[PDB]
């Protein structure tokens, strides 16, 4: 029952069939894993963009 154990012979040729797809470009990076106190500032900063300013900034 003796066998062969581990070989990456023909694994270079399988991986590059479809190709090493590099993710590299997308915009507005996902916002999980963020420092929460920072996020406990920024959601407040967004909700007073709407409410706090019409007349000051638009004019």
């Amino acid at each position: 029952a003796k066998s062969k154990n581990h070989t990456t012979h023909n694994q270079s040729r399988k991986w590059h069939r479809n190709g090493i797809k590099k993710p590299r470009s997308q915009r507005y990076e996902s916002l999980k894993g963020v420092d929460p106190k920072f996020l406990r500032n920024m959601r407040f900063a967004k909700k007073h963009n709407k409410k706090g300013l019409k007349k000051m900034q638009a004019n």
């Binding site: 694994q11 991986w15 090493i20 797809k21 590099k22 993710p23 590299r24 990076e29 894993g33 963020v34 420092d35």
Partner: protein
């Protein structure tokens, strides 16, 4: 069967080099890490809290998260079939800036200023890098003196 554990090939990689066993030089902490920066990862044997892992030594990633005294990076690590975007949490000592963008951002500043002057006097600039062309038809000098003759050496053991 390779004892698939953590930090196992690191007799030489987290080893501080030579004559620089000692404290971390405290400009290591006073570097300003804003978001979006491109920073490189070199492990340090001295700060045993937040060393990354052995498979991220030397890779180049991107800062996404900043805390009190560490920094989160997004890093393009490779696995079996494909290459992944991973999030590491590294303390500051195992970080340094990458001068690839610094010479790049100086490459931007020159190209902006040449663009300023191209509108100024009306001369076409060619700030875009062309590769190193084949040499020009230069004109050597051999004034009076003759070329030194070279023949090979004899063999003596």
């Amino acid at each position: 069967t390779n004892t698939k554990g953590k930090r196992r090939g690191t007799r030489y990689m987290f080893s501080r080099p030579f004559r620089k066993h000692g404290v971390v030089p405290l400009a290591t902490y006073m570097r300003i890490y804003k978001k979006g920066d491109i920073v490189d990862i070199k492990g340090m044997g001295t700060v045993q809290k937040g060393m990354p892992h052995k498979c991220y030594h030397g890779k180049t990633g991107r800062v996404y998260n900043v805390t009190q005294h560490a920094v989160g990076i997004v890093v393009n690590k490779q696995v079996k079939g494909k290459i992944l975007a991973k999030r590491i949490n590294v303390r500051i000592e195992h970080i340094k800036h990458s001068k690839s963008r610094d010479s790049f951002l100086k490459r931007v500043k020159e190209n902006d200023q040449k663009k300023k002057e191209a509108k100024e006097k009306g001369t076409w600039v060619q700030l875009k890098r062309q590769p190193a062309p084949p040499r020009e038809a230069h004109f050597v000098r051999t004034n009076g003196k003759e070329p030194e003759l070279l023949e090979p050496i004899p063999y003596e053991f």
